[PDB]
């Protein structure tokens, strides 16, 4: 688990104008992240548009990422589905491709009990056969509202080695750090990263790292040097970008920046996501140039 | 839409001890519903555990139900998935198997714009090729919170013949009816059926109809005849049953009652749903006996 | 408390352009409700703008209404404040003025424990010295979310004789009735009144009854006779009005209609409520005329 | 924005003053004077009087004025004084605003009016009417979605805090993206962090101070957090926040206001540690921990 500490980009999954997987742009996105000095990749997550892909499509992506990056950076495979059995098939494939860790969102849509959530995690942990599990918590999207004691139980299940904390409650962040001094604890909301680190997170997983992951590692560095102004200046610049991405749609906006940075051929998300509003293309192109000249 | 008015049971998907589709019990459940005098079946919806099934499993159930019941009662295929493309495949298949209509839940998990929801429905309607669309609204589960104006636009899309209203807001039920005098409008919450018809619904789609559909037909008849005491008494008996099912877990409780009714071989839902707590089996066995005495 | 069953108008408190109480319009509005055939008045509730008045103002209104109506119709005094001691002073004043019952909204703003709520009601009941209590439940405004079990404990407290159920959940409406066969159970949402009565309510307390209370009485009649069609027509007509009142602002729209019916001199609510938008006045004026013609 | 510049002197760490009561639940005046002096000696920059913490919403206007008057007698000119004058009623809030001016307060404040749904424009007029009655005292807009039920957008918050006469925001919200957004839009705005359990994180996000209820019993820790961060000493800032949160953990279990009043009782400041009904008493079993906490706090602050 300890080697899982770090700044991990939640990888986007490129598609073509036919909505098919674009494998050439995936390979390029993987190499691009590595060149920015990212610690690892979180593959097939919410950011990866997991839940509009087939299991087969998810596996193909996991396989290719592993081909490109195994041994060079850490690789966490998000294998979560609503189904335990579907989640187990993806866990076993992650193991076969040599991933360092697996991950699963709290199963969603149907109300499940906390005990059913634990057994779900237990099954996936077994099928991962030695890979540590990152319990993925995102109430805003999943509608699963765990109490702190429930969170505490999840993180001490045999084989759990990390929590992806996609929550803006930095009180809870602090309570988790205080209860589990050694837990790998990822900040999930990009736009509060600096504050999340201050509250007790030791790293993060985020969609925006795909295009400015060096800024987030600047924040970890700046904070560790004790340089608050630089930490704040960097968070502020991240949030200027995040404002625009929320206006445009986050995933399709990030893909569009990556298109102008010559990485992703076609910046589409799968339907029912629609295309970026074309009036936002200048801002997005300019941001691309800004970021390209910056690093 | 006209001939789509009525009481339609939200079909459960039966599974064998290995959590595979139990074909024999499925066919048994279809006929058993028909023998209760239901107007139709709503196949592959939430109640049918669609969201823990693959597209081919969902197709297999649709085909078998068409075999058992095409031309004897009305058949509606819930083909909704998060992905538009996935929902399109299921729609094309429902057409091939000879279904009367298609239906789709508002795509969930990722937040989609309302126009995005509109295109999603347009695309599924094209792929259904003549089959009317039943728009399926369930804020509680889907997390999508439509305004009345947005509901009005959706239900007037070319090819929409109906709205499944799984909401407890009976002001909105009446408003919808007032705006659309001829819309087929299905009450979705079993425990307000009587009240929902009074507010403007002209039928229902429900999970608990699988074991007591004749009660819901009895509520329709009684209200039709100005027979209010009888309506209230039937709704009360339905709610005594619904109290218990909410305690046991609704899908698995229903399947367990059907197991004591000699319809379902193994009353399990798919993981992560767990089993029924052993302490409730006496109560559910009692219930089975009572409903068999009845009729 | 069988004698408290019925359709009670939630009395508006008239004000002048200086924002002081208008006692001449208050007296006129009381007689107007009595002439309309109403069963009682609910005085100084939410509709009565209690929470922008002092205790002395609230007492001045309770006194005037008792002078005007005691012995002619039933009188319920809403005495609730956030403070228990303040609510007791009002409960004592209501007893002195010869009210038939007291009522208190679940105390708000500060989160209080359920037991803290129960003691609150006990103390008010004591100060009321023999006047039955109407527990006033309105989650949407109060922010207090009681479970069914908690509701059951409140309604069986010694000295409670009724429940004002301002909730859209008609399943809970049925469950409360089923548990408490003799409880006086008031429907709080005017726009689901017919459906509320069907689910188990035996009456109502409502703001819109001030201008068309005879319609709600017609709904009770129609449903006692099994005339569902008239009940629906009346509820639909109530809801056309409620749609407009929601656009104009409800209390002030009601007060404006009353101004055109020559009952209220000045149709203002207290600041921070603003005035009705003048573009609505032709509609409010036509409504007044329509309702005056109907009788 | 000129009203923001003029309120620059309001930046700081301000305790949300509790209101002590006697055995009959009337104002305990001796204890209030003690509590006020006790806050001053901790090195607190100021007091926020008659807010949620002060149990305003179970007091009459006359009781709120009495508290305002007494606190001014005790602290005027020595530390900054902000008067929470907010009621649901605009006119009630205006009376309290005028009184606060008469007693020499440095600023007024009003929670967004609650219970009834008001439009945004109706909110703006409410603040404007109260600003008029404050007669030159700057306004601190007090935002607390959790308790108020009022859910303002960022654009609406931007408009509120730039109304003429406004010079500060009390932001009792745990959304630190919005904290940063407010700071970036309003470089000179006084911006108080409202949730004690995230103070250090709120400051990092853009707050330039805080208003809180736990400052009554450990305000020097929050000053310690401000100093640690100014110097770039992250370890000291984190250790102080951690200790504040161990204390907040306990108070959430006991009840926050009554738990604070009890600690202060064991610190010899408050005579009777009750809140007003329908608040109930602290559970007997928590008294050992609360005395223990009082002892630890008097130790570390010698
Ligand atoms: C409501 C905030 C939604 N966000 C934050 C924008 C960066 C997201 O869904 C992000 O993708 C999340 O923080 C993971 O990167
Ligand atoms: C919470 C009430 C249970 N439900 C939902 C089924 C999980 C119902 O009563 C509805 O009738 C359901 O949507 C389908 O019948
Ligand atoms: C949100 C509006 C619903 N209503 C009914 C309007 C007639 C109310 O909130 C009423 O003020 C309430 O039901 C009291 O009659
Ligand atoms: C989730 C923390 C709740 N808190 C923090 C102090 C215990 C509060 O509600 C406070 O009363 C608020 O921050 C004002 O100090």
Short mmCIF file of C-alpha atoms in Angstrom, two decimals, chain D residues 54-165:
data_model
loop_
_atom_site.label_atom_id
_atom_site.label_comp_id
_atom_site.label_asym_id
_atom_site.label_seq_id
_atom_site.Cartn_x
_atom_site.Cartn_y
_atom_site.Cartn_z
CA UNK D 54 -25.24 33.22 21.34
CA UNK D 55 -28.67 31.53 21.18
CA UNK D 56 -30.16 34.65 19.58
CA UNK D 57 -33.06 32.75 18.07
CA UNK D 58 -34.45 31.81 21.51
CA UNK D 59 -34.15 35.38 22.82
CA UNK D 60 -36.40 38.45 22.44
CA UNK D 61 -35.13 41.64 20.82
CA UNK D 62 -34.96 43.28 24.25
CA UNK D 63 -32.79 40.43 25.58
CA UNK D 64 -30.50 40.68 22.54
CA UNK D 65 -30.11 44.46 23.07
CA UNK D 66 -29.24 43.92 26.76
CA UNK D 67 -26.42 41.53 25.75
CA UNK D 68 -25.18 43.99 23.07
CA UNK D 69 -25.20 46.84 25.60
CA UNK D 70 -23.34 44.88 28.26
CA UNK D 71 -20.68 43.60 25.85
CA UNK D 72 -20.08 47.19 24.62
CA UNK D 73 -19.68 48.36 28.24
CA UNK D 74 -17.11 45.60 28.74
CA UNK D 75 -15.12 45.67 25.49
CA UNK D 76 -15.80 48.79 23.38
CA UNK D 77 -12.50 50.18 22.08
CA UNK D 78 -10.43 47.28 23.40
CA UNK D 79 -11.35 44.70 20.72
CA UNK D 80 -13.51 44.67 17.60
CA UNK D 81 -17.23 44.20 18.18
CA UNK D 82 -19.62 42.83 15.58
CA UNK D 83 -23.36 42.77 16.31
CA UNK D 84 -25.39 40.00 14.79
CA UNK D 85 -28.70 41.76 14.37
CA UNK D 86 -30.36 39.31 11.98
CA UNK D 87 -33.95 38.13 12.36
CA UNK D 88 -36.48 36.76 9.83
CA UNK D 89 -38.16 40.16 10.08
CA UNK D 90 -36.45 43.05 8.27
CA UNK D 91 -37.90 45.51 10.79
CA UNK D 92 -36.73 43.50 13.82
CA UNK D 93 -33.23 43.35 12.33
CA UNK D 94 -33.35 47.13 11.70
CA UNK D 95 -34.18 47.83 15.37
CA UNK D 96 -31.18 45.76 16.45
CA UNK D 97 -28.99 47.49 13.83
CA UNK D 98 -29.91 50.96 15.24
CA UNK D 99 -29.25 49.75 18.80
CA UNK D 100 -25.85 48.37 17.81
CA UNK D 101 -25.00 51.80 16.35
CA UNK D 102 -26.12 53.50 19.61
CA UNK D 103 -23.94 51.18 21.76
CA UNK D 104 -20.80 51.86 19.63
CA UNK D 105 -20.32 48.52 17.84
CA UNK D 106 -17.76 48.35 14.98
CA UNK D 107 -20.01 46.34 12.63
CA UNK D 108 -23.39 44.65 12.14
CA UNK D 109 -24.18 41.28 10.59
CA UNK D 110 -27.32 39.40 9.52
CA UNK D 111 -27.97 35.76 8.73
CA UNK D 112 -29.85 35.24 5.49
CA UNK D 113 -33.51 35.40 6.51
CA UNK D 114 -34.87 31.87 6.97
CA UNK D 115 -37.98 29.65 7.37
CA UNK D 116 -39.93 31.35 4.57
CA UNK D 117 -38.56 31.13 1.00
CA UNK D 118 -37.55 34.64 -0.04
CA UNK D 119 -36.35 35.56 -3.51
CA UNK D 120 -32.76 36.73 -4.02
CA UNK D 121 -33.93 40.25 -4.66
CA UNK D 122 -35.89 40.12 -1.38
CA UNK D 123 -32.64 39.07 0.32
CA UNK D 124 -30.82 42.06 -1.23
CA UNK D 125 -33.46 44.61 -0.04
CA UNK D 126 -33.31 43.01 3.49
CA UNK D 127 -29.55 43.62 3.67
CA UNK D 128 -29.99 47.18 2.22
CA UNK D 129 -32.71 48.12 4.69
CA UNK D 130 -30.55 46.89 7.60
CA UNK D 131 -27.46 48.69 6.23
CA UNK D 132 -29.53 51.93 6.24
CA UNK D 133 -30.43 51.44 9.92
CA UNK D 134 -26.81 50.62 10.84
CA UNK D 135 -25.98 54.26 9.91
CA UNK D 136 -22.32 53.89 8.81
CA UNK D 137 -21.50 50.56 10.49
CA UNK D 138 -20.28 48.08 7.87
CA UNK D 139 -22.31 44.90 7.20
CA UNK D 140 -21.06 41.31 7.53
CA UNK D 141 -23.26 39.07 5.36
CA UNK D 142 -23.62 35.77 7.28
CA UNK D 143 -23.98 32.66 5.08
CA UNK D 144 -24.90 29.28 6.73
CA UNK D 145 -26.78 27.01 4.22
CA UNK D 146 -26.82 24.02 6.65
CA UNK D 147 -29.02 25.81 9.24
CA UNK D 148 -30.69 28.53 7.11
CA UNK D 149 -31.94 26.39 4.20
CA UNK D 150 -30.94 29.28 1.90
CA UNK D 151 -28.88 27.99 -1.04
CA UNK D 152 -27.26 31.01 -2.81
CA UNK D 153 -25.25 30.63 -6.03
CA UNK D 154 -21.75 32.13 -6.35
CA UNK D 155 -23.09 34.92 -8.61
CA UNK D 156 -25.69 35.74 -5.93
CA UNK D 157 -23.01 35.74 -3.21
CA UNK D 158 -20.90 38.04 -5.46
CA UNK D 159 -23.80 40.48 -5.71
CA UNK D 160 -24.57 40.36 -1.95
CA UNK D 161 -21.01 41.04 -0.81
CA UNK D 162 -20.74 44.03 -3.21
CA UNK D 163 -23.92 45.77 -2.03
CA UNK D 164 -23.02 49.26 -0.78
CA UNK D 165 -22.16 49.07 2.94
#
